[PDB]
Amino acid sequence: DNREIVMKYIHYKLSQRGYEWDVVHLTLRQAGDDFSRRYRRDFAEMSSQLHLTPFTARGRFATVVEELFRDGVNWGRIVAFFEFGGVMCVESVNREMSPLVDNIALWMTEYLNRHLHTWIQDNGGWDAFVELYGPSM
């Protein structure tokens, strides 16, 4: 379920750069591109800030992701969580490490169900988000 959300976002992002790979989705495609725009405004595509290697990616991913929610969670920070993962999958493919994509998605899925699931429920769940973001599309 939350893993499907991860799948469709990864698939979506990967498509967005011409790479194939085998409602909450639409809203989330929207917020991420929204984020995308804002991010590329002040900084350069984050692919440049990513230094990746097969056996260093999981830790890197973890480190960053924890620095994100280290002090709190808000939907903005979660769309960011999404953008981050997807950018890692696109970088992966581009750096000739396509296999990782499948791993990155698992990492995300786990992180979602393990460390964010509580905030989500406590804060209205996914429909809450689909309703907050509603007026931004």
Partner: peptide
């Protein structure tokens, strides 16, 4: 700069922007 700080700033800016786009839509 730090990738995580970049993510937070934008992450927050986006939260603020939709809470506002939400206030408006009321």
């Amino acid at each position: 700069k730090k990738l995580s700080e970049c993510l937070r700033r934008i992450g927050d800016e986006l939260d603020s922007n939709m809470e506002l786009q939400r206030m408006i839509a009321d």
